[PDB]
Symmetry: D2
Subunit: 418 residues, 4 copies
């Protein structure tokens, strides 16, 4: 198991960082490419483990896949329709293959994702969504087995809850259904907007993406095309926090303020000065005193739960307390007892963390548990005093491309080892 | 203390009900008219106590007010700026007086509302939204005291949580600020749309209302005009549920399905046949079995917390159990133990009620506690066996207009008495 | 509708206060006397609205009832078996009438309590506990109708949750059942112990009260007798909070520390010097810095939920934050938005209050919603700057005896008034 | 990693099983023996990973240790005082080393445990209680470092909350203090009672163990002795559920009903025939109808949280719903989504699972995440239709001795493989 050895410092993290394509846009785009009958190019895809898994999954369906900067996909010759346990237990996102498969081939099988470290994370909304589009779905031997005689049919659908994943499953499958689909109470996340933009280039007709009502007019087939994935707003916030919490000064390139206004306002409120350009965001925390903030996770454009662990660390270092309420997932405070091992002060109650204030963390051996928690611990390591060992660092590589290099270019002292 | 004596019946409720203007659009529109220098007419306003309290409150500022079908307001000669405790303790919506006063006159005092039966209901967002428009705000003798030297200044504001009230405060006040305001993560409720249509008729420049990003270009003054208040989606919901739970058959006039797509979909799922027209909605339940649903309250267009009490009842009488989860207010199951007095089966756990199934309620003396719970008890009274006395019915009059007359036309047996 | 006009001061509250008998012991014991075939005298009973309500409820069953220092009760000639809606809507402890009546007479009807301000407060455990003693129970037109053909039958009962009320129902009712009952996971509140002491004087055979396992050996009947009610630990805590929060000095007479060790340790943790005698407790906070504390309400001997609102105020005036977590009742933070009107700082999330720090509160008009919140507002009145009007003050009289007079003896400026 | 291959059947699980000594007794007793200057012998100790790890902990302090039926410990020559990271990350109960060490040697160091999967599990109450006995405690490099100049000082302590672990820590440490200690609001779990019996045989002076006030009079030193560990009530509960959920008939030996009255009563309420002897409990579910039940977890003698996963399975197979509220640990529902893979039906909200009804589960591949979930998954494997693979089965050996053997003796078809 790979680990990070991090040697901390009161040195501010400063410099520049090039922000990669969004993990959470590139995934649903690549799964959406199953619908396409012609070759497809997806530019600005980061190198992550979840993309290798996704790439392998498409290969195992009969698609031809190749990558470096872009990923090229020829989904034309797809002639298998299963996403097996072996891969799904690796990556629950695999659920996204069920919609495109049934919609294009009338058939689809996908291992039901078991339990996630951050929550039970059921998929009822995906299932009920495709059923509403005319599919028949069962569970046999732990596989969600879906099928429809003919084409899926357009329907008016109102989501019980706001769900990113399910909004996508339904929107994507609806592109090849007969007639028109109106999905109400959809999620507004910008990766949804990007997945629609991509599909529309292939010959789909999706309108209202990024509003709570999405209209999809079904077409008989989708073609080919090129698309550059939207920048990663979470990677972006992650580095801004890294600068904020170290009295630092950083500019993020190839990223856009409109993707993360809630985070940018919270960072301004915690003391930072923020500037924005055509395609960059800068943060200056030099000579500014870090102040605690109150936070409530919520659907976009509210505060994203993917920034929650990073702001737990911020508040732990910020004077004036700091309270974080997590509404989205039920078990996403696993970073707290780890940070406590480094001398951090906080208390948990239901869905809320109440942070104390601490001048400086102490290096210690800690263990990553999930993707965003993992990053917070590495940042903690950078500012702490002495040597930090972050075990199980493969979690980071699921969502950050070569984070040790990116942070090293900012003055961090990080070693990847076995 | 007025009461309702209801004699229940197995007879399904049938007929027509004419839906009134939305209470929650009428109110902010009325408070918004404080910004107007010229006479205003607000049509399609229901007769509720809360609208009387709002009228009394404008009178006390120096406005000229009168009504019957419409409400007529001349806020030109206003020369006092305090909303006093004796009225605010009656109706917390009075905080809406603060923003217009300070925006137009540079000054405002409103009594800080105390505890609500359904929740703590703080107004921290209203105060902090106004502070970002450049107002200086104190609390003194229980009065939220706001002031600004000159005009408020437009700003970029990102809401910390979704709030209907706070969104309104900020939008209305920004219509007279110098420069442009952008309000992100605003509430999307349809009463916000209405208020904004109203304000634009007076010379305001508000775009994006009904989306999560509201842009307001400030103007130096607003003039006069005439506006008709959007129909009440909650009152619509309430009668649709009455029909459904008595296995009956109704049509609601002067309403629009697009105001309540979440409610209509749960009524369909529960078994009801629903048709919609240009300005009407019907529900037919005759010879259809009532089926339990799970519901989760959320901000519009999700399932409204103002429909939750009524849907508790529906589940209590429906087969298959039913689960209602309330995310918005922390204490809105006060109806449950009073319904249990009538023989209902339910268990509360945290923010969730788990309903059993019951064939028919039994009449009993019960007590209304809040507006929406009140109507649930009344509906319950109509289907129960024997006589139900609902104490403290003045709550119903705050939000429904002569509901004993509307239900009477549908065949209910209801007496108002002391 | 009565109010208090409180005028605040920085002068610490100082002096003595004589603790009355526990309301929450007085009540079960009076409902318990329904079992008694002959005269009973209950000493050390406070003068409260809830006791007046209990005495009328007893009268309406056919008991003969008088009071002043004590309450005298002859339950011998009881001839009716209904607790009517008009009384239960007033006081939900009226549910305790169900078990004695069914146990002694084979029958009892009691109106099913509605919603309470502080939580839904179902009574399913009382009912189920009585069903398991052999009773048949139905809900008919809002009334809990219980009957049994003959005497109740002892049973081994394991409580699904800890409930003060239900433990008492089952305990009392069991004293006239045939054979032996063992109640497990029983509440251990001292008011249960005192009710058990009371019943045993009348010829009952209750053992293990105050532990999690209570054995009741049923008897055929119960005599009469005399009992002085245990001190009120909540009133005790409430005055000790008053001294502490006013940076003052107090001694409470006719009370015992062993009733509230959890409150005392938190008061010491808040920075107070506390001393105890055989029947008194003193607190001195003079020259001392009030420090915030974290609290988790929990069954006795844990931190009592009835002290929560008062400790909410304590933490709001204390430095260092302060976190209060309520695990018992679901909606018991109504005092918070009212204290906010007086300038307090706190935020609520779920079952937890996170308190800020404030040097001095500010007088304002405020509304009592419940008994314990009522007292916290009064105490806040005493230390705030200026005048405070506490509306709907009748709540306080449900559980405190002439509280304005007790506070006035300490230095407070309080006026009960109308209109 | 070892796995179980289970092949399910409708065959009822029937026969006998011998209950071992309680895991949760044997551990605190073996940590308690750090106090003793003379050899100690602890009989009826189960063969479990956690007991190997404890024996290793003890040796590393310099104690002499053998086992098989019993564990022998000679703590006399202890010359070291650290519980290192490499052991604590394996088993957080190593915290119980801290108290005995500082009590006996004036010094102790223990790695601050990180996150547990079932909750954050802080240890604040152990620290604050040892400080109240006169210890000075610090956090340094992730180690809890305790020390006192001389002997500990008996104190009057009220626990902020009920904690099994801290109760024991404070109780054990107090046996060597100068003077008397009174631990109010103490935990009452029978494993505390057992530990105190063990200590009094060595010369300690503990009384009240079993109630909420424990009085310990300090002595100078403690000698040696023999003690048979109390039967495991959770292992007992677990086999009783296995029979109940299989329409089965079982008798458990070397166990006592008074250890688990809460569980027996819910089993009876579920429709099972229970009978109890001097040292046995039997359950007969043959030809009986399994009925759902409600459970609220709570401190002993309430319903134990270590039975909650098993009772989740039970209610999932029982008719009439089933609600389970967990009030002790904040993330103890990880079995749920894994059972869903097997066709189980249930939803979760906050601290509560709302169970549906299923006639028979479907074999699938599933993942154990903790001790009690692990066992519930194996039992589900025995009653499901088809083949079930439970991965990461080492979890189960942390607390159940040779469970595949105990279950085969009841009819089951289980295979341990790699
Ligand atoms: C795009 C991606 O690869 N993963 C992201 C995606 O996860 P994901 O799409 O799983 O997140 P969702 O918005 O679907 O889920 C949010 C909440 O809704 C619940 N829910 C969801 C579906 C369902 O059928 N039933 C149900 O109850 C989930 O358990 C969770 O409690 O959005 C999350 C919300 O920002 C991000 O944190 C994840 O990083
Ligand atoms: C229009 C009107 O007269 N009343 C409606 C309005 O109330 P209202 O405008 O009060 O509702 P909000 O959306 O503002 O409140 C929603 C949640 O946000 C919280 N919050 C609100 C303001 C604030 O400054 N801080 C804060 O934390 C509230 O306590 C609540 O828990 O919207 C509610 C939600 O649809 C409706 O049920 C009410 O019937
Ligand atoms: C007259 C009297 O002595 N009143 C006290 C008594 O009230 P009371 O006896 O009502 O309080 P309980 O101990 O019964 O209630 C504890 C918890 O159990 C729940 N519950 C209770 C009974 C039941 O049948 N089902 C059920 O679910 C309640 O809703 C509550 O959440 O104890 C409370 C808790 O210490 C004190 O605050 C009250 O001042
Ligand atoms: C080795 C052992 O005997 N383990 C058992 C023991 O664990 P353990 O002794 O760790 O359990 P505790 O009773 O201490 O913990 C109960 C609750 O208190 C909290 N807490 C605990 C200690 C502390 O210092 N601060 C704090 O907040 C925990 O988060 C938990 O939510 O009791 C549990 C409760 O039945 C059982 O499930 C475990 O199997
Ligand atoms: C953990 C985050 C989930 O189970 P995965 O499928 O995304 O790994
Ligand atoms: C209850 C709904 C609130 O407290 P009000 O101010 O509207 O009376
Ligand atoms: C409120 C405290 C309850 O409903 P009561 O019966 O004591 O008035
Ligand atoms: C999980 C059960 C805890 O971390 P452990 O230390 O007992 O493994
Ligand atoms: Na902080
Ligand atoms: Na139902
Ligand atoms: Na404080
Ligand atoms: Na609540
Ligand atoms: Na079930």
């Amino acid at each position: 198991m790979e680990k990070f050895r991090v040697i901390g410092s009161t040195q501010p993290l400063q410099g520049e960082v090039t922000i990669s394509g969004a993990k959470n846009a590139a995934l649903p785009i690549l799964f959406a490419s199953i619908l396409a009958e012609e070759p497809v190019e997806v530019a600005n895809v980061p190198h992550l483990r979840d993309i290798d898994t996704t790439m392998e999954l498409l290969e195992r369906l009969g698609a031809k896949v190749e990558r470096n900067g872009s990923v090229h996909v020829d989904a034309g010759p797809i002639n298998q329709y299963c996403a097996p346990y072996d891969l799904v237990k690796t990556m629950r996102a695999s659920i996204w293959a069920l919609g495109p498969l049934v919609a294009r081939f009338g058939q689809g099988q996908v291992s039901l994702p078991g339990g996630c470290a951050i929550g039970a994370r059921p998929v009822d909304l995906h299932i009920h969504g495709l059923e509403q589009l005319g599919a028949t779905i069962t569970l046999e031997d732990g596989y969600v087995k879906a099928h429809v005689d003919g084409r899926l049919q357009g329907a008016h659908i109102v989501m019980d809850k706001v769900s990113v994943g399910a909004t996508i499953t339904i929107m994507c499958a609806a592109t090849l259904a007969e007639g028109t689909t109106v999905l109400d109470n959809a999620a507004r996340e910008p990766e949804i907007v990007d997945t629609a933009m991509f599909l529309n280039k292939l010959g789909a007709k999706i309108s209202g993406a990024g509003t709570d009502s999405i209209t999809i007019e079904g077409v008989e087939r989708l073609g080919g095309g090129k698309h550059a994935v939207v920048p990663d707003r979470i990677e972006t916030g992650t580095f801004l926090v890294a600068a904020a919490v170290s009295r630092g000064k950083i500019v993020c390139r190839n990223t856009h303020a409109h993707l993360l206004e809630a985070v940018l306002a919270k960072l301004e409120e915690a003391g930072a000065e923020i500037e924005c350009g055509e395609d960059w965001i800068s943060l200056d925390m030099t000579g500014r005193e870090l102040k605690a903030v109150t936070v409530r996770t919520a659907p976009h454009p509210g505060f994203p739960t993917d920034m929650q662990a990073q702001f737990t660390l911020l508040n732990m270092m910020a004077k004036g307390g700091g309270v974080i309420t997590e509404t989205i997932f039920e078990n996403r405070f696993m970073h707290v007892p780890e940070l406590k091992r480094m001398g951090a002060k906080a208390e948990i109650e239901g869905n809320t963390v109440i942070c104390g204030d601490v001048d400086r963390l102490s290096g210690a051996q800690v263990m990553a548990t999930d993707l965003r928690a993992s990053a917070s611990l590495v940042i903690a390591g950078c500012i702490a005093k002495g040597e930090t060992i972050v075990d199980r660092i493969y979690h980071i590589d699921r969502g950050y491309e070569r984070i040790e290099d990116k942070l090293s270019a900012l003055g961090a002292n990080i070693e990847r080892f076995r």
